[PDB]
Symmetry: D2
Subunit: 257 residues, 4 copies
Amino acid sequence: NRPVALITMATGYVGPALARTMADRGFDLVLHGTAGDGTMVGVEESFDSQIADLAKRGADVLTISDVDLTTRTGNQSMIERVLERFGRLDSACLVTGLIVTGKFLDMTDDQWAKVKAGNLDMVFHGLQAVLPPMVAAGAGQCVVFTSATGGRPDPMVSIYGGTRAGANGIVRAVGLEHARHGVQVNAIGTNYMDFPGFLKASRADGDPERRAMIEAQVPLRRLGTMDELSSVTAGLLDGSNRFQTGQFFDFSGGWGA
Amino acid sequence: NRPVALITMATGYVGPALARTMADRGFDLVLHGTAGDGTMVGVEESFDSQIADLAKRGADVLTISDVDLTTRTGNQSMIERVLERFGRLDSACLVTGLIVTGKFLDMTDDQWAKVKAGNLDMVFHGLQAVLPPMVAAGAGQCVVFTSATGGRPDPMVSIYGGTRAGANGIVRAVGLEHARHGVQVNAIGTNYMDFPGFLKASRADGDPERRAMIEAQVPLRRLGTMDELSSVTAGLLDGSNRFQTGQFFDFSGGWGA
Amino acid sequence: NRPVALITMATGYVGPALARTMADRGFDLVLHGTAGDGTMVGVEESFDSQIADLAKRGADVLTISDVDLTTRTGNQSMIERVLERFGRLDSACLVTGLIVTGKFLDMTDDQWAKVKAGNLDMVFHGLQAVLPPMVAAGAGQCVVFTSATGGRPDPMVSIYGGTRAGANGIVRAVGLEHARHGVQVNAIGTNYMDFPGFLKASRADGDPERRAMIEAQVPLRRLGTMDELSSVTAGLLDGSNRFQTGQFFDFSGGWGA
Amino acid sequence: ENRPVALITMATGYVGPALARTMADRGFDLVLHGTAGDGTMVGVEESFDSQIADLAKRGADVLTISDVDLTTRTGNQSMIERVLERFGRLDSACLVTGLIVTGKFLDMTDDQWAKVKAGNLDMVFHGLQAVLPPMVAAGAGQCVVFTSATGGRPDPMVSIYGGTRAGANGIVRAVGLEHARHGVQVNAIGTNYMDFPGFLKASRADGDPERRAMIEAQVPLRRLGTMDELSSVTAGLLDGSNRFQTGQFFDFSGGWGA
């Protein structure tokens, strides 16, 4: 019997690559994201284009694209649909967050209201939904993607970086509370990754002059690739490492060290 | 003229002792308080008994008891009133939070909203109100009280400790973002303190067998007094130390070491 | 043109397991350790027996067991022999440390001198030996095994825990000082692992119920295996992840969260 | 009548002078250890001849100790033996430790490595071993070990120095927790960008405003810390007013180590 791996926001960021890598390791996948083709605001790899590659790797694919992951209902709905299809949930990769930057005294009630939703509510409702089935099974592995800024909340990223630290804080407590059930909850915070999502936050967009200045701010003088991030993320979701929980791993080329 | 120091939730916890020593250090006082049934500090010393003593120490007191610090309007209104009374704001001690404990999967949507309001809203709107008058003056010292759990979000205090950890991160960024203006924003996190609030929550206010057990959980084998906590807090708000900002300080007899 | 992977104290702990998986990933190997067989003073797997298996996995092997890794000579010499055999060093796993425990005030000038040599001198000399060949090549992946006590130096393990924390600090700085040359240097710190060393130093066999008392102390209620550890270790040395450096990874089932 | 005793090492510079004045104001008798001599000497920012005079006007007696090697058991053990014979008690101790060593990690020699270990680690291990017995017997005591803000963020060009300082904090943490049940506190203060010679020389900005202008700009609060500020914070951990912190590390670098 093939285990199941849930990957939220799987139309972009690490989802696609992680989906291919998790399939190779013998997992069935339940991708969540934005339904659509390459010409979409939040889609860089479509479901159908993915389902054909994951099927050649021997994986069945449930897809979910009609849930507000910032609410209890949307998260519980996703999990209820995952369990009726496959009847199990062994791994969950909850990608969370809304990026908002600027001066702390220019932040508005709306910005403050919506950064808590992306960075904290997605984590709280996401974990309340994925854990119950893992607790009953006696084994599970979760990876909550927060942000490297949570490890070092810096100026001009105050509310965004602070709430991410709160997310990592929740992850630690939750990772240790359910460790005695064989369920692992860990956090992975990235920064300076090579994907269009981060290219929108920083006005580099492949610009050689602006790209070089961004690559200069990281100790390893390069941006991270989704092939690298998927490898380490799968290491915490493929049952090959069951001795880490409640921890936060900075993945930013030495930036968050 | 005398420097002005604001103290929130000043009827309990560190408020009383802090105002006593700050007056001894030459500060005028703005004491904020609340008797709302849903508040964590409580009423340990009434403003009626405090203004009497603090006036014997040479301080003029402004009292505020009709503002909700979980909202922008309440905080902004509170700062309108201090600047009309004294025309300046130098030090600010923002006590925040709303205690909620339990197993992560037993948390309700309102317990999750009550902790976001106490632990994060009071800080976002509190800091957005005290900083402008300090930045204009080019000087200022702020201390926001979070909790020792922010440095170690443990099981059974997942969303409390977690949101405290998010507030400590906000403090880090804000304390650095406004360091250029000579503004200090630090955060103190306490635990195992000797005051009616904690004594009653742990059911050790009239129990010797309980206190002995409770105190054995602190490396220093005792509960911290408010004179100790005010002495440490006053050193970050009396002008004697202008070289620490954006930092978190554990105050728990080593529990958070 | 297979890349080379150096592993030290490869007769026990992670050495044996790591070698196999590194061989599985296409690495020629250089193994340091002691001579003997059958846990004969730290020999969990004799070199004679390892090369046999590592050869079936298509990996050449060089053995070194006559150097003192607490000195500049032994380390600089060990690398002289690695490069004359293969002419390259792409990965290095430096295992370091001599265990000492007891009351801090009962420690002697001898115990203090010993733990410094195992926990600090080995790291300092080791890194000065493996880095040069990687800096020249422009690529390299190093891992220094310290101890989970380095993330939380506790009583009864003061000098041992502190010196480990010193090792981590070095690894942090060194990992950042050479990230611009494309060289990674990270640290792993374990505790409660299922291997003769910890088992003997914790009364594993003899009071076998004591093992249950020890497992109760780990959040995940188990001892880690060298397969899990080698999988994580290999992931920082197999070239799949080149976006982390100067970081410390606790590996103690959450005990260091 | 009966005054508490406070031991301060390396008292001729850094924080010792400003710390000795505020401790005496708080009613403490003092034990000053330093590399004694006149102001014209290296590391001597304020001679004991002048310090002792100032502290007596503040109502504090003073004992001087200037012939011990604080990197060895014999030195610290002797220092404390002479402290007890004079005052019969030891209540507070501020152990200043370390020896600055910077540069690229590869360029580090066995002698540099051996020396940063003796300054950042040997002084801590032996110092705490000598200070704690009388404090434990007295059921109460407070120690502050001065490491370095680098211990909180070991950066490039300061590897072995910051690394060993990190270990120093780790020892302070373990030792601070192990003896908390005896009423004894041990904490660590790590500073940087302080306005005093030792740092001004290391940073290569002693007589240069242009370079110091750059140095201060590296600090969030855009200035260098003063010994009055540091002595104030330090005295709070040694004057009996705060007995609820131990095994902790306090960064004091204007936000640089936040």
